[PDB]
Design a binder for this molecule. Structure first.
Ligand SMILES: [Zn+2]
Length: 46
């Protein structure tokens, strides 16, 4: 089963649907386009 393993530290940009982390916003923002899905705000809002 998938594991939420990560390296020492945490990225400022992270997805919710796929749960992927990006180095920059441009990448994430653009990535979303792929998802092409409309979902609510999950837990751990922070
Ligand atoms: Zn995503």
């Amino acid at each position: 089963g998938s594991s939420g393993s990560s390296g020492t530290g945490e990225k400022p940009y992270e997805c919710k649907v796929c749960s992927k982390a990006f180095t920059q916003k441009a990448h994430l923002a653009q990535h979303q386009k792929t998802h092409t899905g409309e979902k609510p705000s999950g837990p751990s809002s922070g």
